Amino acid sequence: MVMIDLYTAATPNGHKVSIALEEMGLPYRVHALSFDKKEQKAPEFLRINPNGRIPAIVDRDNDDFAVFESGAILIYLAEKTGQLMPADVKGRSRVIQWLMFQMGGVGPMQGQANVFFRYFPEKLQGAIDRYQHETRRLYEVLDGRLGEAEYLAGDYSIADIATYPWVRIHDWSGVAVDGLDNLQRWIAAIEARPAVQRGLLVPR
């Protein structure tokens, strides 16, 4: 009956969703998509995510309803389970605000830092500096907020789940967290959670 099909890969955006699924205890199975073999481009997967990127899910119990965009998936699952996002207007919106900050800010900016710092054919220091500097500024925003509240929206939520897989890999991105004591507390808190440990292993 209840079954989420998860199409994913070992990346921060993929880990957002596997962590959420493990936190919520929903049954799911993995299709690990191989970049090398063009799998994310096949018409069969594009029928699920026309953007041809992971993660995406198909909710088998909802007439095989497809959801793409990690942030939209986190919302869909939170609403499905009633977990990790409060039901009240203000509580709901705090979560969505910080989820959007991750979706429009942290992910894209840290993603571009990775691109130029690690992947781009040519070393473009100005582009590297732009994105590491911007990523750091965003980390300082998070750090400030985490001085006011234990987790981004108050209690641990999909907002933290969206953001943590990115912060986790800051060194790879070439961005430091030193001096950000609230962010560090939060990093240590979330990395300790058994569901986070489990989700980080998916796909194997």
Added chain:
Amino acid sequence: VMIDLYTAATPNGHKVSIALEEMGLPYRVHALSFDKKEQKAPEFLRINPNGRIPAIVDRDNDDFAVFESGAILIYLAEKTGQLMPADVKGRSRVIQWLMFQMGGVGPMQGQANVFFRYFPEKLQGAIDRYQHETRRLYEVLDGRLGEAEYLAGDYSIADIATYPWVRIHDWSGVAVDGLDNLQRWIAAIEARPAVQRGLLVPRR
């Protein structure tokens, strides 16, 4: 007015002024002067710690602050029951395309703008990267727009979030030529009176 809007004449600000105009919500405009560093006044950071526009404060609701354009759109849609369906599939379709815009179109077209128009040096590889990625995202929109009249079916906050970016494609150096469905959608949306009004906020 029950809503205070902090904004500027950018695509992200326009998303929100279009939405307010569509929904018939009264609002007071606070046009932040970046020339005078108003986005860095401590008083504004208490509303949006990211120090960007737009942001709102809902005076009707204990002066609740909402930042992130995508989160403001969801907040306003839920408040009024307009421009996003109540049912599970319909609401998720809207959030999926909205997240597509917030994590994809806005960020990628925004970086095209940076390297094409504003960056201290001309890095042709960076310009190409983001203009190409932006066109690809437009192609995805165009495919979806063959399946439905608007991105989530009926016109919604997902279209409102996407249109102000697509509108300025030439500023970004990105063509919409050859994308008939996207072009149909452009023409439909630009003809909406609330869109015409929202694009004029704030006054010069």
